């Protein structure tokens, strides 16, 4: 705590991302600084969802990718914590527009 919590310095983001019902989407983080400069995360950070997740939103822990196939249309936000190598978390989201055929 003389040195600062990694989730101070960085900023998990996803895409949004349409999906149609009965197809697969997937989609994948991005990180900035905190001047939206690009940024590598540290290697080893985590990736879970959160309890109220959709149950078709399936997460990759190692990085983070999210595989989405819906489902009911509308608008969801997947809750994913992020865990850094600290033991420093970020919450974020995927934002996912589900559509009908
Ligand atoms: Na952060």
New binding site residues.
Partial sequence: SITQPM??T???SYRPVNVEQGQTATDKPSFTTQDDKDATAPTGTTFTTGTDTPTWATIDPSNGTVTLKPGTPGAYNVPVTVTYPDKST?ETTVPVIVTKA
């Fill in positions: 989730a101070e960085y900023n998990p970020d």
